[PDB]
Design a protein around this ligand. Structure first.
Ligand SMILES: COc1ccc2c(c1)C(c1ccc(Cl)cc1)=N[C@@H](CC(=O)Nc1ccc(N3CCC([N+](C)(C)C)CC3)cc1)c1nnc(C)n1-2
Length: 127
């Protein structure tokens, strides 16, 4: 039913960088999705208590959301772009696993994922 602790966004032991690709992921990819009309369900961890979803964290064992991704990018938590791309893909996949085709939340995830794919297609080569 209690929410779990959120995903990690701070860990001094983890080595960090700021690459041109990670800068693009913040300034282009995250900013584009965050401002969209369908962003709001994805701007923070799923609150299973307030939403009355007592089975959510039985089914979803690798939670992810754009609030967590925003904190990771603004904190320079990542070593490379692939780590961050994986977090976006985990967020979309969790939504499709929990819900059903044609549900409103699935239509919202599909619209955001289309934009994600259009932006990642022009990820710059690493300098
Ligand atoms: C802060 O609000 C959030 C956050 C995360 C998610 C959601 C909403 C939403 C969400 C849903 C629709 C729209 Cl338009 C937007 C969002 N979906 C949730 C998933 C959700 O809640 N599923 C859901 C489905 C059916 C019901 N029924 C309860 C019995 C009712 N009864 C009258 C007795 C017959 C019938 C309805 C209840 C819950 C979600 N999944 N990923 C994310 C992110 N989310």
């Amino acid at each position: 039913s209690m929410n779990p602790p959120p995903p990690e966004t701070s860990n001094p032991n983890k080595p960090k960088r700021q690459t041109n690709q990670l800068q693009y992921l913040l300034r282009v990819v995250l900013k584009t999705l965050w401002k969209h009309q369908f962003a709001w369900p994805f701007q923070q961890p799923v609150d299973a208590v307030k939403l009355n979803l007592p089975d959510y964290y039985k089914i979803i064992k690798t939670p992810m959301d754009m609030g967590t991704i925003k904190k990771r990018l603004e904190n320079n938590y990542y070593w490379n772009a692939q780590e961050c791309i994986q977090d976006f893909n985990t967020m979309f996949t969790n939504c499709y696993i929990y819900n059903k085709p044609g549900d409103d939340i699935v239509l919202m995830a599909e619209a955001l994922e289309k934009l994600f794919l259009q932006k990642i297609n022009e990820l710059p080569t690493e300098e």
